[PDB]
Structure formats: C-alpha cells, structure tokens
Structure 1
Amino acid sequence: GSHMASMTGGQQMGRGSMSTKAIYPGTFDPITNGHIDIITRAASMFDRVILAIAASPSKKPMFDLEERVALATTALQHLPNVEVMGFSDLMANFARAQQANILIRGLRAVADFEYEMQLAHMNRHLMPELESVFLMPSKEWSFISSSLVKEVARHAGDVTHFLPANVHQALMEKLK
C-alpha cells in the first residue's frame, strides 16, 4: 500500500506488475539478425535482458566464448537495457544466480514445439518462479540459423543480409 514493508515484503503473483529480468540463452555461434530481432523485441517489453552465451556447448563451436561474447556485445551495444554474459550451467541455475524471472525462447519450427514444451515443464520443476516466454521470428529471419549461415558461407554463398557487419567480417576471417 505505502510503508507496508514493516508488514510484508510482497508476493510475485496476484498483485499487479513486478520488475522483470529476462535471460535469453543460446550458443550464438555466431549471433545472427534473427537473434538480434528476438532480443530487440524482448528488450522492448521487459525491464532488463541478459543474452546468456553457453561456454561449453556439446558440439565444438566455430567461435570461442570470448569471441562470441565480444561479437554479441558490439551487435547489441545500441540496446541500453541488455547485457551479454557467458554461463556454464543449467539455464535454470544461471537464472537463479542472476535473480531472473523470465526465460526467453525463440520458436522457429513446428518440429521444435514439442521439445520446447518439454523443457518448459522441466524448468518449471527446477525453478517454479521462472516464467518461459515464447517469441516467433520475423518472416524475414524465419529460415536462417547460425548453422545454415556458416555452411552457406563456407562455400562462398552470400550471407551479408543475415549478419551484422562485425559478425560478417569475423566469419569471413574464420573461413580463410
């Protein structure tokens, strides 16, 4: 009500809008225009957003953690309420450590919907106070992935439309 701290600290649910802090996890190897679109949209609706970059992914990434964090930091510099960080745990544990209450997930294909629903249930089990939120990609970026952009670039296909300049330069450098 006013000076009610003496009485209560407050609950998350039932009581109006709360401060929101979102994590957007991935490998971002490297970050594409599709990722930038998702995080831009998320940063417009939530107070703070962390782009969380996985340190040790299952498959060895083309860019190391340091390179991935640096490229993403530059690409997202124009968003005041976004921070880029590496992590090496369950997304649920990183979110707990970072006191985040929102998990951002991109939803590209029908094939992925089943898996995403399963992960959301598991994350609710691990961290009940973490809410998963799902954003569909713009039509423009609906077919791109980091993986497809790399494979196209490896055979000299034009991918300038799909990446920010900083990332495009770094990628060309990686491929000779």
Structure 2
Amino acid sequence: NAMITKAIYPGTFDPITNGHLDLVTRASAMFSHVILAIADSSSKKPMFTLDERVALAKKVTAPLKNVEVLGFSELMAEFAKKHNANILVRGLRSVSDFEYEWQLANMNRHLMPKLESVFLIPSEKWSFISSSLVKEVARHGGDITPFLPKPVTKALLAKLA
C-alpha cells in the first residue's frame, strides 16, 4: 500500500554542511517529498542572509529530485501545516543535541499533533561537524574543505577573504 510522505527538514543551515547534506540525502531516499526548510533566524544574526543560504542549499541539493528548498520565518510546525507535511526530520549528532530535540519534539506535538518528529544520526564521517566551529576555523584561514560542499567552501572563503 503506497503512500505520499511529505517531510520537512528545518534548520538555520548557516551554511549547509556535509552533515546536513548527508541527512537530506537520506531523507530524500526515504520520503516521497522533502522540503529543506531554512529558518530566517534573524535574532541569531546568521553569517549568510536567508537568500544566500537558500541559494547554497539549492546548489548542493540540485541532484535530489524530490527535494525542494524554501525559506521561512514562522514556526516550523505552522510551516509544516502550511505545506501539508506529516514528518519533521531532525539530526541528532550527540547527547547535547538530544535534550533540545526532546523539548522541541514535545512542543511540536502540542502545536501540531499529527506531525511526526523523526531523528537521523549522521554518518560518523560528519557527526562532529558543527557550522560554528567550521566558521571559526575559516575565520583564521584554516582548511575547511573536508566539512563543506565545494560551492559552500567557495562562498565561505569569499564571505571572509
């Protein structure tokens, strides 16, 4: 019995990393449709504007047919309801991640009871990768090429040099 599963994968993606890419690629294999959903996150003062983050995520998800990249600024749950998504995908890289995802998953069960939160663990290759430490390394001209897709490295380097 075939089904349409529509999933959202929301985050700040500032910038999208090899870790994010691994997760959305796996979500893409599992669900009928995936929205890679980029939170405006204004109060976080992101390095990249929302438009830049949308452009970068489009470049790296281009080969995934059933993935669409969209910017949003409302609650992730309202965004899911707006797009008729029934699954919310989140990454769990470690124990510190777990606390917050548990709180958030419970909040979201209250806000949208039929939205199911599901968690994916990145491959051990990428699991230690953190947008913030990569940005800190790049600020000092350290080599970050192992952690970011090629077009993302190029934009991070331009944004700094």
Deviation at 1:145, TM superposition (A): 1.2
Deviation at 1:57, TM superposition (A): 3.5
Aligned mates of 1:123, 1:158 — CA distance in 2: 38
Matches of 1:52 and 1:68 in 2, distance apart? Answer: 10
**Structure 1 segment 6-155 matched on structure 2, within 5 A:** 18-155=3-140
The answer on whether the counterparts of 1:27 and 1:57 sit within 8 Å (CA) in structure 2 is no
Q: Of residues 115, 133, 158 in structure 1, which corresponds to 2:143?
A: 158
Q: Which amino acid in the other structure matches residue 107 of structure 2?
A: M
For 1:127, the aligned partner's letter is M
Which of the two has higher C-alpha Rg?
Answer: 1
Deviation at 1:116, TM superposition (A): 1.0
Percentage of pairs with the same residue? 71
Deviation at 1:122, TM superposition (A): 1.1
Instruction: State the Cα distance separating 1:56 from its structure 2 match.
Output: 3.2
Instruction: Identify unmatched segments of 5+ residues in structure 2.
Output: none
Q: Which amino acid aligns with 2:17?
A: T
1:128, CA displacement in angstroms? 0.8
Give the count of matched residue pairs. Answer: 161
CA distance in 2, matches of 1:149, 1:137: 17
Distance in 2 (alpha carbons) for counterparts of 1:27 and 1:126: 20
List per-residue Cα deviations over 1:14-71 (Å, max 9, x = no partner). Answer: xx65310000000101000000000000110100000000113422111001100001
TM-score normalised by the chain length of structure 2: 0.97
Q: Residue 132 of structure 1: CA displacement?
A: 0.4
More helix by share: 2
Q: Distance in 2 between matches of 1:135 and 1:124?
A: 18
User: What is the identity, as a one-letter code, of the residue corresponding to 1:48?
Assistant: H
